[PDB]
Design an enzyme around this catalytic site. Structure first.
Site, PDB file in Angstrom:
ATOM      1  N   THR A 155       0.814  -1.209   0.000  1.00  0.00           N
ATOM      2  CA  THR A 155       0.000   0.000   0.000  1.00  0.00           C
ATOM      3  C   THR A 155       0.852   1.265   0.000  1.00  0.00           C
ATOM      4  O   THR A 155       0.494   2.255  -0.644  1.00  0.00           O
ATOM      5  CB  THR A 155      -0.938  -0.008   1.203  1.00  0.00           C
ATOM      6  OG1 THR A 155      -1.641  -1.253   1.250  1.00  0.00           O
ATOM      7  CG2 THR A 155      -1.937   1.109   1.080  1.00  0.00           C
ATOM      8  N   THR A 156       1.972   1.262   0.725  1.00  0.00           N
ATOM      9  CA  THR A 156       2.863   2.416   0.692  1.00  0.00           C
ATOM     10  C   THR A 156       3.598   2.503  -0.639  1.00  0.00           C
ATOM     11  O   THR A 156       3.852   3.604  -1.152  1.00  0.00           O
ATOM     12  CB  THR A 156       3.860   2.341   1.847  1.00  0.00           C
ATOM     13  OG1 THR A 156       3.161   2.061   3.065  1.00  0.00           O
ATOM     14  CG2 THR A 156       4.607   3.652   1.991  1.00  0.00           C
ATOM     15  N   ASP A 184      -2.565  -8.644   6.769  1.00  0.00           N
ATOM     16  CA  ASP A 184      -1.595  -8.551   5.680  1.00  0.00           C
ATOM     17  C   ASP A 184      -0.958  -9.906   5.396  1.00  0.00           C
ATOM     18  O   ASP A 184      -0.794 -10.294   4.232  1.00  0.00           O
ATOM     19  CB  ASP A 184      -0.520  -7.518   6.018  1.00  0.00           C
ATOM     20  CG  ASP A 184      -0.907  -6.113   5.599  1.00  0.00           C
ATOM     21  OD1 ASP A 184      -2.118  -5.844   5.451  1.00  0.00           O
ATOM     22  OD2 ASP A 184       0.001  -5.275   5.418  1.00  0.00           O
TER      23      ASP A 184
HETATM   24  N1  LIG Z   1      14.654  -7.451   5.034  1.00  0.00           N
HETATM   25  C1  LIG Z   1      14.446  -6.621   3.985  1.00  0.00           C
HETATM   26  N2  LIG Z   1      15.477  -6.018   3.358  1.00  0.00           N
HETATM   27  C2  LIG Z   1      15.283  -5.193   2.315  1.00  0.00           C
HETATM   28  N3  LIG Z   1      14.076  -4.896   1.810  1.00  0.00           N
HETATM   29  C3  LIG Z   1      12.958  -5.433   2.342  1.00  0.00           C
HETATM   30  C4  LIG Z   1      13.082  -6.345   3.485  1.00  0.00           C
HETATM   31  N4  LIG Z   1      11.834  -6.723   3.809  1.00  0.00           N
HETATM   32  C5  LIG Z   1      10.986  -6.108   2.949  1.00  0.00           C
HETATM   33  N5  LIG Z   1      11.658  -5.338   2.078  1.00  0.00           N
HETATM   34  C6  LIG Z   1      11.065  -4.519   0.997  1.00  0.00           C
HETATM   35  O1  LIG Z   1      10.143  -3.589   1.560  1.00  0.00           O
HETATM   36  C7  LIG Z   1       8.959  -3.515   0.773  1.00  0.00           C
HETATM   37  C8  LIG Z   1       7.756  -3.647   1.690  1.00  0.00           C
HETATM   38  O2  LIG Z   1       7.605  -2.459   2.456  1.00  0.00           O
HETATM   39  P1  LIG Z   1       6.352  -2.343   3.452  1.00  0.00           P
HETATM   40  O3  LIG Z   1       6.761  -1.570   4.680  1.00  0.00           O
HETATM   41  O4  LIG Z   1       5.740  -3.717   3.564  1.00  0.00           O
HETATM   42  O5  LIG Z   1       5.374  -1.439   2.554  1.00  0.00           O
HETATM   43  P2  LIG Z   1       3.929  -1.994   2.127  1.00  0.00           P
HETATM   44  O6  LIG Z   1       3.242  -2.258   3.441  1.00  0.00           O
HETATM   45  O7  LIG Z   1       3.327  -0.872   1.322  1.00  0.00           O
HETATM   46  O8  LIG Z   1       4.248  -3.229   1.324  1.00  0.00           O
HETATM   47  C9  LIG Z   1       9.001  -4.655  -0.229  1.00  0.00           C
HETATM   48  O9  LIG Z   1       9.029  -4.120  -1.553  1.00  0.00           O
HETATM   49  C10 LIG Z   1      10.286  -5.402   0.042  1.00  0.00           C
HETATM   50  O10 LIG Z   1      11.008  -5.585  -1.177  1.00  0.00           O
HETATM   51 MG   LIG Z   2       3.870  -4.255   3.064  1.00  0.00          MG
END
Ligand SMILES: Nc1ncnc2c1ncn2[C@@H]1O[C@H](COP(=O)(O)OP(=O)(O)O)[C@@H](O)[C@H]1O
Ligand SMILES: [Mg+2]
Ligand SMILES: Nc1ncnc2c1ncn2[C@@H]1O[C@H](COP(=O)(O)OP(=O)(O)O)[C@@H](O)[C@H]1O
Ligand SMILES: Nc1ncnc2c1ncn2[C@@H]1O[C@H](COP(=O)(O)OP(=O)(O)O)[C@@H](O)[C@H]1O
Ligand SMILES: [Mg+2]
Ligand SMILES: [Mg+2]
Ligand SMILES: [Mg+2]
Ligand SMILES: [Mg+2]
Lengths: 232, 98, 528, 532, 523
Positions: E88-89, E386
């Protein structure tokens, strides 16, 4: 027919041209002419009743409550508290007639009102107002020429004052002094003739002092071949 | 360029395409824009022409600086690079005299 | 747009940009032109404007009407400015400039709405105006004879044409003759201050007269003035700037005496100073005494005892006119009142005109000034008569400067429009539309004449176009016969530079209006 | 003197005011014309947002106070109702006609002559279009329909995806085709159910080979999918039977109360077994279904849907061959339900669409129906997609019914302008100017297109007019009638080969409506506005 | 006056600039809430509550805005949340970035239609590249499922307890899975309810093998613990009520009143006997139960619960394999719910909770959340939602995509390489919207705290090599690491939905140049 123009542009943006244009009125063409003619007719019909020996007086009250009973058209219109601009034009016309001639200040207003009244029904038939004005000018020239033609001459000699006395009586007939008519005309004629430059020159009015005091009778009015002052 | 009708606080009408006059008759309230206006007026006083050049160059420089700040560069690095490039431009300019 | 907590311009600043604001400017110019549209031609009409104080102004002059309008639209004020410029430079044509400029703008409005770049329009206007001015200078009729009678006839015809749209048009020959006679007596500078204009209420227009000298109203006579004779058959006039009355010798003067003999000597000295001035004036040989400064009652009685005329507090302009007419010199000191500095006229007389006293200085043979005495039934009547006479006087002055005339009634503009259309028919085409629009806009004046006269404008315009195309230069609108005629043969004559300045000012105004793209309006300071 | 309690405007003032109002209305929507046009965003002063490009919708949403501007607003509404396309061109043309007619009137031409000239010019323009500028679609094929749809969907949110949206539109329109008496194939648009649901991209929009309901099953116990659906469409509620107002129950013997109360629901029970005994699987009703009948349907393994919209139920019954039954009453005074009242479909499914469920009646027999599910990014995008889709469906319907099309991109307007400018010289003496002004006013459409394209309108329109003049002068250059405007490259282009078409009825009706509106407004020379 | 007094209209470059600026501001609001190192925000509910979360949709849902572009962005957030439940972000940030790079071109003399066409072509290429770089997933392998869920929830507050939450989500989704009549469904919404009881510890949270409701027995005498109960579910009331028809009575004899009351009692007894004929142990009904009915049921030793919500009753029916009936006269043996292995009414805190938590093969479940307070449990519920949404998305589509910005950079590089063969005017917007995808690694690095420019340059250089599509940024250490060894992966459906939604948001806000407001609804 008022408020000037209220458009505010065809794109929605403000459209201001004249300062305070929302609070200003405006008349266009024939409607303005009709309004002016109607105002002039009202003034002339007010004036026409005070015309002639049988004319009645108008009893004017100013802003301070002072009362002036009079028959002089110029005096009535000068004291009249008008707001219409055409009424002001009538007032100024009467005052001009008073200044140039001194008599006939009521005839001019009635004549102008009648002329505009006829011009109204002429305009209603689709004649340009300039054409009406040109016709009026031509007819006025004809009338003036006819007046010169039918005019008659009188003797202005001191030895015979009868035509002068008759003319003064004709002037004074419409006023309130018609009770003392002949005496008052005689004193006016003698006052003019005593102080005047005989070679058809001017008559200096400031050498005639007109002083009035209450009491007595109107018949006691007299011409003094000297000076009277409010001193002892 | 097109002329602009400007009505100042006294309802005096100015129609012109002179940048310095337009800035002078505008009631500028944002103080960064005030600094840029002072720079333009200083250019007008020193030389007499090029005020619009000063304003356009300042705006372009600040937009590209904003882009550089967004991509990751620090303010100090951007300022140092701008000063170096200005020195290089001032060095190059005499060679462009025709 | 976003709130932007710190805003750039001051709050309340209004900005309009792009094509819509240009279209709005054109519409405002159209509105301004409409306000003076019906005051053009012999069939024109007057406009009455009432100010805040209630005083009304009735006028046919376009510049006057525009000035009395409180126009605040920045683009519309340009029309008022160019009307005032035409009034200043020429004096006639203030109605035509606004109509021409607004018609230019209206004609180019459709092309503006199409996104045409304004610089092309401005260049086309400049080129068309240059060509039109050159054509006017080329086809203007001038006579190289230096004939006095022909020059006077040309002046009279030009004055009549300039006068045949006002309320004095019925007597246009009379006032035209007066104006020509008055202008021909100015020496070399044709200064307006040397032509007096006195308005005396009451009397017909035919009673108005031009004085071959100077005349002014009686100025607050003191006691004993009525014993002074009011007619002289060969007077010498002493023009003075002197206060002839008993007064303190100086503002900072102070008298210190310690003896009654000195007191009597002081009072006698004051009386002797005044009587010495009066005796010098009397022994100068003058019979009429005029002073810019007040003349006291003692001096009035002294002059009356000598059968002499005095008039204090005469306005400075009237004294200048008297000096230029009689031919004396204004004196601040009476110590040397030689015969060189004394005015002279055939006859001086005081006469009454419509309830007012006027002093007449007539018979001056070498006078370089004039005095118009106007009669009418109202003060606005006399004001409009003065405005019309001012227009005629300006026209006659410009005709004196150069006797280059063109036929009026829209004939010159039909010739210019035909020439410009022919020129535009031989260019690549982007400028062709603009120059054709300019030529079509040049048709507004004859069309406005026909509309004001109540005619049918379309048929008259078609006939004029056909006549000009097939041959004929000076064919314009014939108002009396509701047709077209050779206006040059009808003596509808105008100075060429009148139309030259009209076209130049209208084109400049149109170019300035078109050049603007953004209007910024700062908020008022101290609205109170 | 009149003493009328109101404001009176007369002469040139009211005419100029009316023309100003019409011009303002036109200028509102002039920026949404042609492929280079841009949409508009309307806010309903409560936060409601409407993003749209349709001129009729914009004018209907706006608040209009001037009567002359209203006239144009319902002019656009009428154009939408009678045609469905060109609701902006009609407004622009009407306003330009009014403007030029007012100019003529200000030139002291009597308005009656202008009206007569406008009528003559409209008649001649219609005749010239009919006998010179039409193209028969018989020899063009399905490509003509595809190109007409693509042209209609240009200047809309679905413009770029036209290559797929036009195929979908044509398929749906051909699917809902039916033939009536007199052998005239009619295409009843508005029988295509348009369902909007945000979610996946535009390209994921689905065209259902059947019908789509915005309803779900009444009970979670019923199956969500039946293969051989026997649809039974009902128009009465299946609830506990209640006696009407004219009948009362008065009990004097207590032994009858239980029987009364039991029969009160056993009546509806028996109706349910009568419906179900014939083999029905899907039951659709406009009225509600209470809990007990829902359980009855659950036990039988059938699907029951309640509160079905009447128009959707009618479409389903028509497509599936079922008959709407407002009551179970035969001509023998009995309660019955025959198998002949059952509609059939190849499958009935309740699919999930972005956290919501809707019922798909797939592949109805005895008639082919269609429905479109529009997938967008949010509600505003879906609404605009629906409006554009309706415009495309209307355009395709007009093309299929009236089998003539005309070139687009201002070709028709330029051809009419040239022809009418030539024709004006042959008629009258003062109405000739009116015909010439009509011809000039017809040129606003290409001018508006070019201006929206941020291009030089003057030279482009001059080239277009030169092309059409050459076409109308040289008999052997008649192929230039199709020269239109290419807005992308800013050059004249043969629009017939370029695939830029539109129905002839659009231009004809737009011209007639605009001429009538301009004539109506042109007859006002006096306005009296009484105070409220 | 043509339009109303309150009708405000503005158009031109100002409208486009304002729309793009509003979208940029909306993006800037939740910029810091992306990645494993994101920080939470406190939202003050106007009704008085407190929402403490870092979920993009949860944050944006509580924002009240006036600019319609901001409203459009909020609707985009809601649509992304509803369609897939994650990313969503990311969609908001991507939409803001594309709108910024579009404003760049709009400042020049490029018409918005060209930018829109370039955007759509780029979106098609983006979808193609994502489908290319995807990898399959074996759903039978529970380890991959748990790892995917972990990568989904590693950016939320529940990340401290990752194994427990992952197991809860996976078990709930797997057991709520259902198939009937050839139709497959998951239905996390209706079933798999999340019920939170504040207090206790979070480690005590578990997914029950059945349904728990906040209900107690209608009277103390019935059993609060039944081993293998046969549950019967009802919908109608078990009490005597008026009929629909106007049914006035008239009594003239002495015994008619007593007979009426005795018939009421006899009707209740008849209903109870009809229920008892099936020999059940538990009776659950939607509505009230009369006291006489309770006595009659107790005489048959039956526990009865009344006033159960319809959704809870449906959940119980799915869990224990029962059918809700309305008329007890038609109660069949098939409708009796056998399959529940334990029913227990126990006291938690000062409230009674009914447990049916030993069902064999249950198709419904309840997730019992224990925590510090109500807001913490609300955030945990959002995180679990989620997780379940990601689980069902990857269970429907077994495609998987590298995370941590690796997919963004890979797609950007592929689009940039494809842009070398355009030679048109659309190549510049195409390349700009291609490079706009770098905002995700950029914001990950910014939230991590490392140097954005150097790390981004290193990543861009790395992605130019022959096989580096799985190279992303370690969001918690700010280093370039291959994502096939870090283990971060995302479902292909989530990435596809995010990209499509962001591109179409940019298109929709680019299609607009005029704004009119102030008019009433006129209806
Ligand atoms: N351990 C990690 N290291 C690097 N990137 C990550 C990690 N975990 C998640 N991500 C990245 O962060 C993004 C998810 O961000 P998030 O806070 O879940 O936003 P949203 O809730 O909108 O998905 C994903 O695109 C993923 O590729
Ligand atoms: Mg997310
Ligand atoms: N006798 C006449 N016949 C036809 N037109 C005339 C005549 N006299 C003047 N005109 C026209 O009247 C116009 C001047 O009108 P006027 O209002 O007096 O001055 P302005 O030039 O400011 O309009 C000139 O353009 C001239 O052509
Ligand atoms: N691809 C195209 N190329 C050139 N012109 C087009 C194209 N598509 C449509 N047009 C023209 O643009 C004009 C405006 O259409 P539009 O305004 O979108 O429809 P409406 O008038 O229903 O709103 C139409 O007259 C059509 O001829
Ligand atoms: Mg008398
Ligand atoms: Mg310069
Ligand atoms: Mg003049
Ligand atoms: Mg259309």
């Amino acid at each position: 027919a008022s408020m000037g123009t209220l458009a505010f542009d065809e794109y929605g943006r403000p459209f201001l041209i004249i300062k305070d244009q929302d609070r200003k009125s405006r008349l266009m063409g024939l409607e303005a002419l009709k309004s002016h003619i109607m105002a002039a007719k009202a003034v002339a019909n007010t004036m026409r009743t005070s015309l002639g020996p049988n004319g009645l007086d108008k009893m004017m009250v100013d802003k301070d409550g002072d009362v002036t009973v009079t028959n002089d058209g110029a005096t009535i219109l000068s004291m009249m508290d008008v707001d219409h601009q055409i009424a002001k034009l009538m007032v100024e016309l009467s005052k001009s007639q008073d200044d140039e001639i001194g008599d006939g200040t009521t005839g001019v207003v009635v004549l102008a009102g009648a002329l505009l009244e006829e011009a109204e029904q002429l305009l209603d038939r689709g004649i340009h107002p300039i054409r009406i004005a040109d016709g009026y000018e031509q007819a006025a020239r004809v009338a003036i020429e006819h007046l010169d033609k039918i005019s008659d001459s009188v003797l202005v000699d001191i030895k015979d004052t009868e035509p002068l006395i008759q003319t003064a009586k004709t002037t004074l007939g419409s006023k309130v002094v018609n009770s003392c008519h002949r005496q008052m005309a005689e004193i006016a004629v003698n006052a003019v003739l005593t102080v005047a430059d005989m070679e058809r020159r001017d008559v200096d009015f400031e050498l005639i002092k007109v002083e009035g005091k209450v009491g007595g009778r109107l018949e006691d009015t007299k011409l003094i071949k000297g000076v009277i002052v409010d001193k002892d | 360029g097109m002329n602009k009708m400007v009505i100042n606080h006294l309802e005096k009408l100015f129609v012109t395409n002179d940048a310095a006059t337009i800035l002078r008759e505008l009631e500028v309230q944002h103080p960064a824009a005030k600094m840029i206006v002072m720079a333009s007026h200083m250019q007008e006083q020193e030389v007499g022409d090029g005020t619009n050049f000063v304003l356009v160059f300042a705006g372009a420089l600040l937009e590209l600086a904003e882009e550089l700040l967004r991509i990751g560069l620090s303010v100090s690095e951007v300022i140092e690079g701008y000063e170096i490039a200005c020195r290089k431009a001032h060095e190059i300019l005499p060679n462009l005299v025709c | 747009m976003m709130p932007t907590p710190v805003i750039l311009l001051k709050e309340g600043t209004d900005s309009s940009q792009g094509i819509p604001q240009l279209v709005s400017n054109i519409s405002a110019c159209q509105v301004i032109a409409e306000a003076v549209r019906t005051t053009l031609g012999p069939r024109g009409m007057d406009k009455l404007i009432v100010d805040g104080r209630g005083k009304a102004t009735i006028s046919n002059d376009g510049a006057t009407i525009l000035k009395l309008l409180d126009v605040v639209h920045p683009a519309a004020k340009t029309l008022v400015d160019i009307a005032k410029s035409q009034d200043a430079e020429v004096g006639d044509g203030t109605t035509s400039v606004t109509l021409l400029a607004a018609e230019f703008l209206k004609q180019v409005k459709p092309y503006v709405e199409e996104g045409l770049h304004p610089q092309i329009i401005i260049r086309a206007f400049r080129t068309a105006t240059q060509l039109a001015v050159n054509k006017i200078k080329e086809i203007a009729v001038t006579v190289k004879k230096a004939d006095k009678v022909e020059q006077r006839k040309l002046l009279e015809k030009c004055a009549m044409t300039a006068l045949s749209s006002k309320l004095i048009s019925q007597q246009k020959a009379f006032f035209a003759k007066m104006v020509v006679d008055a202008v021909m007596m100015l020496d070399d500078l044709l200064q307006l201050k040397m032509i007096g204009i006195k308005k005396v209420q009451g009397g017909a227009l035919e009673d108005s007269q031009l004085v071959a000298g100077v005349a002014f109203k009686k100025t607050f006579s003191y006691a004993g003035f009525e014993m002074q004779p009011k007619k002289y058959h060969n007077p010498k006039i002493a023009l003075l700037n002197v206060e002839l009355e008993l007064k303190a010798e100086k503002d900072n003067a102070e008298i210190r005496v310690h003896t009654v003999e000195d007191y009597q000597a002081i009072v006698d000295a004051e009386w002797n100073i005044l009587y010495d001035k009066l005796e010098k004036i009397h022994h100068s040989g003058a019979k009429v005494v005029l002073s810019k400064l007040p003349i006291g009652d003692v001096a009035t009685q002294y002059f009356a005892d000598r059968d002499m005329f005095c008039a204090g507090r005469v306005p400075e302009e009237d004294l200048k006119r008297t000096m230029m007419a009689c031919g004396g010199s204004i004196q601040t000191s009476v110590n040397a009142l030689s015969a060189d500095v004394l005015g002279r006229c055939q006859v001086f007389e005081e006469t009454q005109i419509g309830g007012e006293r006027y002093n007449f200085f007539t018979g001056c043979p070498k006078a370089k000034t004039c005095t118009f005495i106007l009669r009418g039934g109202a003060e606005q009547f006399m004001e409009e008569t003065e405005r019309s006479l001012h227009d005629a006087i300006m026209i006659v002055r410009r005709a004196i400067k150069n006797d280059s005339v063109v036929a009026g009634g829209g004939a010159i503009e039909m010739e210019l429009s035909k020439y410009l259309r022919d020129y535009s028919r031989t260019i690549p085409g982007k400028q062709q539309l603009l120059i054709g629009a300019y030529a079509k806009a040049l048709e507004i004046i004859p069309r406005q004449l026909c509309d004001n006269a109540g005619f049918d404008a379309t048929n008259i315009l078609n006939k004029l176009r056909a006549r000009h195309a097939q041959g004929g230069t000076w064919y314009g609108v014939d108002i009396n016969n509701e047709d077209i005629a050779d206006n040059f043969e009808a003596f509808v004559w105008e100075p060429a530079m009148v139309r030259i300045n009209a076209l130049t000012a209208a084109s400049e105004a149109a170019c300035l209006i078109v050049s603007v793209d953004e209007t910024i309006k700062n908020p008022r300071s101290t609205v109170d | 003197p009149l003493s009328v309690f109101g404001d009176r405007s007369t002469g040139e003032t009211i005419r100029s005011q009316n023309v100003m109002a019409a011009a303002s209305i036109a200028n509102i929507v002039k920026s949404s014309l042609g492929p280079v046009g841009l949409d508009k965003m309307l806010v309903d002063d409560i936060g409601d947002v409407t993003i749209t490009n349709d001129g009729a919708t914009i004018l209907k949403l706006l608040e209009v106070e001037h009567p002359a501007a209203k006239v144009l607003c319902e002019l656009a509404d009428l154009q939408d109702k009678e045609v469905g396309d060109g609701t902006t061109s009609v407004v622009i043309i009407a306003a330009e006609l009014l403007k030029n007619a007012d100019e003529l009137v200000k030139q002291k031409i009597h308005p009656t002559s202008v009206i007569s000239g406008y009528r003559l010019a409209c008649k001649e323009a219609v005749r010239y279009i009919n006998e010179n500028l039409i193209v028969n679609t018989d020899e063009l094929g399905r490509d003509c329909l595809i190109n007409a749809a693509k042209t209609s969907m240009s200047s809309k949110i679905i413009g770029i995806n036209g290559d797929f949206f036009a195929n979908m539109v044509v398929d749906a329109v051909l699917a809902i085709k039916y033939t009536d008496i007199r052998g005239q194939p009619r295409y009843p648009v508005n029988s295509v159910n348009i369902l909007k649901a945000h979610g996946r991209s535009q390209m994921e929009s689905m065209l259902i080979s059947g019908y789509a309901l915005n309803c779900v099953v009444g009970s979670q116990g019923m199956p969500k999918r039946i293969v051989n659906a026997k649809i039974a469409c009902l128009d009465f509620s299946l609830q506990k039977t209640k006696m009407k107002l004219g009948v009362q129950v008065v009990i004097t013997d207590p032994e009858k109360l239980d029987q009364i109360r039991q029969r009160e629901s056993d009546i509806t029970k028996e109706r349910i077994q009568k419906i179900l005994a014939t083999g029905a699987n899907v039951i659709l009703t406009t009225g509600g279904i209470d809990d007990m009948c829902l359980k009855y349907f659950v036990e039988a393994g059938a699907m029951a849907v309640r509160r079905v919209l009447k128009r959707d139920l009618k479409r389903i019954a028509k497509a599936s061959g079922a008959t709407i039954l407002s009551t179970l009453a035969n001509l023998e005074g009995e309660e019955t339900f025959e198998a002949a009242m059952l509609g059939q479909a190849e499958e009935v499914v309740q699919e999930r669409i972005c956290d919501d469920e809707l019922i798909l009646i797939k592949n109805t027999k005895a008639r082919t129906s269609a429905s479109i599910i529009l997938r967008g990014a949010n509600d505003f995008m879906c609404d605009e997609m629906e409006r554009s889709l309706h415009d495309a469906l209307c355009v395709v319907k007009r093309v299929l019914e009236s089998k003539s099309v005309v070139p687009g991109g201002g070709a028709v307007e330029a051809a009419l302008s040239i022809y009418l400018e030539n024709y004006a010289t042959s008629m009258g003496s003062r109405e000739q100017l009116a015909i010439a002004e009509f011809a000039r006013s017809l040129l606003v459409i290409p001018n508006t297109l070019a201006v929206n394209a941020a291009q030089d309108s003057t030279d482009l329109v001059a080239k277009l007019r030169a092309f059409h003049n050459e076409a109308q002068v040289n008999p052997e250059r008649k192929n230039l009638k199709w020269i239109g405007l290419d807005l992308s490259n800013g050059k004249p282009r043969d629009n017939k080969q370029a695939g830029v078409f539109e129905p002839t009825i659009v231009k004809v009706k737009s011209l007639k409506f605009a001429t009538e509106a301009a004539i109506t407004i042109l007859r006002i020379d006096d306005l009296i506005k009484l105070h409220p | 006056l043509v339009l109303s007094q309150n009708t405000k209209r503005e158009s031109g470059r100002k409208v486009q600039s304002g729309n793009i600026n509003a979208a940029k501001t909306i993006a800037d609001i939740i910029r810091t809430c992306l990645g494993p190192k994101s920080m939470m925000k406190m939202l003050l509910d106007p009704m008085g509550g407190i929402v403490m979360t870092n979920d993009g949709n949860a944050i944006l849902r509580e924002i009240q805005v006036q600019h319609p572009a901001a409203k459009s962005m909020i609707e985009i957030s809601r649509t992304q949340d509803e369609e897939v439940g994650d990313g969503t972000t990311s969609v908001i940030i991507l939409a803001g970035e594309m709108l910024s790079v579009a404003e760049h071109f709009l400042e020049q003399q490029m018409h918005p239609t060209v930018v829109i066409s370039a955007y759509r072509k780029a979106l098609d290429d983006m979808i193609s590249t994502l489908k290319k770089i995807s990898i399959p997933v074996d759903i039978s392998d529970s380890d991959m499922m748990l790892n995917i869920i972990n990568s989904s929830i590693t950016t939320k507050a529940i990340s401290r307890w990752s194994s427990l939450a992952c197991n809860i989500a996976l078990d709930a989704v797997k057991m709520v899975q259902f198939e009937e009549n050839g139709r497959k469904e998951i239905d996390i919404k209706k079933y798999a309810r999340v019920e939170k009881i504040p207090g206790g510890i979070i480690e005590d949270s578990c997914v029950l093998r059945g349904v728990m409701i906040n209900k107690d027995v209608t009277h103390p005498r019935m059993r609060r613990y039944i081993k293998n109960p046969r549950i019967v579910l009802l919908d109608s009331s078990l009490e005597y009520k008026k009929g629909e028809s106007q049914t006035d009575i008239e009594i003239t004899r002495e015994e008619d009143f007593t007979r009426i009351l005795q018939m009421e009692e006899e009707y209740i007894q008849q209903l109870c006997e009809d229920i008892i004929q099936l020999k059940p142990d538990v009776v659950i009904t939607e509505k009230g139960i009369s006291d006489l009915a309770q006595h009659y049921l107790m005489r048959a030793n039956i526990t009865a619960i009344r006033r159960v919500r319809k959704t809870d009753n449906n959940r119980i029916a799915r869990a224990c394999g029962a059918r809700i009936v309305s008329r007890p006269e038609e109660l069949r043996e098939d409708d009796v719910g056998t399959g529940a292995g334990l029913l227990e009414i126990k006291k938690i805190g000062d409230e009674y909770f009914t447990f049916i938590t030993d069902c064999k093969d249950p198709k419904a479940c309840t997730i019992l959340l224990r925590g510090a307070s109500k807001e913490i449990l609300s955030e945990v519920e959002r995180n679990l939602q989620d997780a379940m949404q990601v689980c069902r998305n990857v269970l429907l589509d077994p495609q998987l995509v590298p995370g941590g910005g690796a997919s963004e950079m890979a797609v950007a590089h592929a689009l940039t390489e494809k842009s070398k063969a355009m030679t048109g005017v659309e190549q510049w917007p195409y390349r700009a919207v291609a490079q706009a995808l770098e905002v995700i690694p950029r914001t990950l690095i910014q939230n991590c705290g490392a140097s954005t420019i150097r790390l981004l340059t290193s990543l861009r250089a790395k992605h130019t090599q022959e096989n580096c599509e799985t190279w992303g940024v370690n969001g918690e250490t700010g280093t370039l690491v291959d994502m096939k060894e870090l283990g971060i992966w995302e479902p292909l459906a989530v990435k596809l939905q995010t990209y499509k939604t962001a591109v179409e948001t940019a298109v929709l806000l680019l299609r607009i140049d005029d704004i009119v407001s102030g008019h009433k609804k006129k209806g």
